[PDB]
């Protein structure tokens, strides 16, 4: 026989399928609204000029390639916590926190999930919004935790079901884990507003729930990193000792460099010391130590004041392009004579948008218009450009009118 005769073929990657179907289409009008990364106004990858500058200035220094500590680059870790929390947060000043470098946002989630499995004796349940990032489920599941849900997306408004979400969260059994997207919910782009978050924080604190924030889009979501991190900060100001996942894939465009971090906010520095040793003991048999290159870039940008300013402006410019496209999409839908409400499109935030389109309409969009997207109605806004937005509005109008 063979060792692996009984190993089945896994399911096809559905996004990969869309992107590949997109590549084969010879329609000069085609659009890839399944792309999982930022694109410029001509549909190209974008390497941030501040990143190119940072890299050049690293190359000039003739650095070694030695192993990083298990927790990664110490100055990346510190700059990264400062970015998330704000430079004068009481948490930094007291040092009641540990931040370790991870293999991007996914890496941070996987290391968090392993830490919960092993140390969060209070629960095995992690509550995910409905819906959540697809990979959140297998992450927590392979880490050895259980998944639950809470109402989030409202398919009747294509907005935030605040009343269902709040009701649900108030009946989560006490001391469960509640996963929260910091901003730019994936896949819907629907976010709670600041008053909604205050209410959610107040139930969390009341019911003694543990808040696990996923933050893949600070800055990138609105152009304002302080506004994007406001919820996380606010939960911390209210007495909630969150844990936090950060990713530099979108905000710095470091996708393939794999740069992210996991932070546990603790009672005090001594507790953070013990959490850190235990994070290290878990990190080491995953991958020993994290990659160097991307972390060098991020630290150089975050700790150099000229490079940081330049970086903040470039982030603001990506965020601005996405906001532009949503607006111009809604505008064009009106010119077309659409009579549907499309404000969810300007109401949502980040590069992912739940359109409210039905699966049959999506199929018309692929077949008749060569507009490629997933069956759940999710478009990646990064595939919209000023050149093709008029066409998108037309196509969508045709399939919905």
Ligand X SMILES: Cc1ncc(COP(=O)(O)O)c(CN)c1O
| Residue numbers at the binding site for ligand X (CB under 6 A) | 104-106, 133, 181, 186, 214, 216, 247, 249, 260, 288
> 296 or 326: whose CB is closer to a second copy?
296
Helices (runs of H) and strands (runs of E) counted in the chain: 16, 13
Contact 166, 203 (CB under 8 A): yes
**Could you tell which of ligand KYN, a second copy, ligand X, none binds residue 220, using a CB distance below 5 to 8 A set by kind?**
none
Residue 249 CB, nearest approach to ligand KYN (Å): 6
Tell the residue number behind the tokens 């995910």, with chain if given.
128
51 binds, among a second copy, ligand KYN, ligand X, none (CB under 5 to 8 A by kind): a second copy
Residue with Cβ nearer a second copy (155 or 269): 269
DSSP-assigned states of every residue in 52-109: HHHHHHHHTTT---PPPPTT--HHHHHHHHHHHH-TT-HHHHHT-EEEEEEEHHHHHH
Q: Where does this chain touch a second copy (CB under 8 A) — which range of 43-51, 80-88, 180-188, 367-375?
A: 43-51
Is residue 214 annotated as a catalytic residue, yes or no? yes
264 binds a second copy (CB under 8 A): yes
133 known member of a binding site = yes
x/- contact string, 282-321, with a second copy (CB under 8 A)? Answer: x-xxxxxxxxxxx---------------------------
Number of other CB atoms surrounding residue 332 within 10 Å: 19
Catalogue the E-assigned strands of 94-175. 97-103, 125-130, 146-151, 153-154, 159-160
CB 318 within 8 A of CB 217: no
Using only C-alpha atoms, the chain has a radius of gyration, in whole angstroms, of 22
Strands 146-151 and 125-130: parallel
- Quick one: what does residue 10 bind among ligand KYN, ligand X, a second copy, none, with the CB cut-off 5 to 8 Å set by partner type? a second copy
**What are the structure tokens assigned to 279, written together?**
């994070």
* Closest residue by Cα to residue 78 from 106, 101, 94, 60: 101
Q: Which of 298, 320, 192 is CA-nearest to residue 254?
A: 298
356 is known to lie in a ligand binding site: no
Q: Specify the DSSP element, H or E, that contains 181.
A: strand 177-181
Per CB under 6 A, does 288 bind ligand KYN? Answer: yes
Residue number, 326 or 378, with CB nearest to ligand X: 378
Contact flags string 55-74 toward a second copy, x per CB under 8 A: x---x----xxxxx------
Active-site option among 250, 311, 342, 347: 250
| Rounded Cα–Cα distance for residues 210 and 115 (Å) | 13
Enumerate residues 34-53 that contact ligand KYN by CB under 6 A. 36
The DSSP bridge partners found for residue 103 are 259
Nearer Cβ to a second copy (4/367): 4
133 flagged as catalytic = yes
| Residues catalogued as catalytic | 133, 214, 250
Residues that bind ligand KYN (CB under 6 A): 15, 36, 67, 106, 186, 288-289
Binding residues for substrate: 36, 133, 186, 378
Residues that bind a second copy (CB under 8 A): 1-10, 36-37, 45, 47, 51, 55, 59, 64-68, 103-104, 106-107, 110, 114, 119-122, 135, 138-139, 141-143, 210, 241, 249, 253-258, 264, 266-267, 271, 273-275, 277-278, 280-282, 284-294
């Amino acid at each position: 026989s063979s060792w692996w005769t009984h190993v089945e073929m896994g399911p096809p990657d559905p996004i990969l399928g869309v992107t590949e179907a997109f590549k084969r289409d010879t329609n000069s009008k085609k659009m890839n609204l399944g792309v999982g990364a930022y694109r410029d106004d001509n549909g190209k990858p974008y390497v941030l000029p501040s990143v190119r500058k940072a890299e050049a200035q690293i190359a000039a220094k003739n650095l070694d390639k030695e192993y990083l500590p298990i927790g990664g680059l110490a100055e990346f870790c510190k700059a990264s916590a400062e970015l998330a929390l704000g430079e004068n947060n009481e948490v930094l000043k007291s040092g009641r926190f540990v931040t370790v470098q991870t293999i991007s946002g996914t890496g941070a989630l996987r290391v968090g999930a392993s830490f919960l499995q092993r140390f969060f004796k209070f629960s095995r349940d992690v509550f995910l919004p409905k819906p959540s990032w697809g990979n959140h489920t297998p992450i927590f599941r392979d880490a050895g935790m259980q998944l639950q849900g809470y109402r989030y997306y409202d398919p009747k408004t294509c907005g935030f079901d605040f009343s269902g979400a709040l009701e649900d969260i108030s009946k989560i059994p006490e001391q469960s884990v509640l996963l929260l997207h910091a901003c730019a919910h994936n896949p819907t782009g629907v976010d709670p507003r600041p008053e909604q978050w205050k209410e959610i924080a107040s139930v969390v604190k009341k019911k003694n729930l543990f808040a696990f924030f996923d933050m893949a889009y600070q800055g990138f979501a609105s152009g304002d990193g302080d506004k994007d991190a406001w919820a996380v900060r606010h939960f911390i100001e209210q007495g909630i000792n969150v844990c936090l996942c950060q990713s530099y894939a979108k905000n710095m465009g470091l996708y393939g460099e794999r740069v992210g971090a996991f932070t546990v906010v603790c009672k005090d520095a001594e507790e953070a010391k013990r959490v850190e040793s235990q994070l290290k003991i878990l990190i080491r048999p995953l991958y020993s130590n994290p990659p160097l290159n991307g972390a060098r870039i991020a630290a150089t940008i975050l700790t150099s004041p000229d490079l940081r300013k330049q970086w903040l402006q470039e982030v603001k410019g990506m965020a601005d392009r996405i906001i532009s496209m949503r607006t111009q999409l809604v505008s064009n839908l009106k010119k077309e004579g659409s009579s549907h409400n499309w404000q969810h499109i300007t109401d949502q935030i980040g590069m992912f948008c739940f359109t409210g389109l039905k699966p049959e309409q999506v199929e018309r969009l692929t077949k008749e218009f060569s507009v490629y997207m997933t069956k759940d109605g999710r478009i990646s806004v990064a595939g919209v450009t000023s050149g093709n937005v008029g066409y998108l509005a037309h196509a969508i109008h045709q399939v919905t009118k």
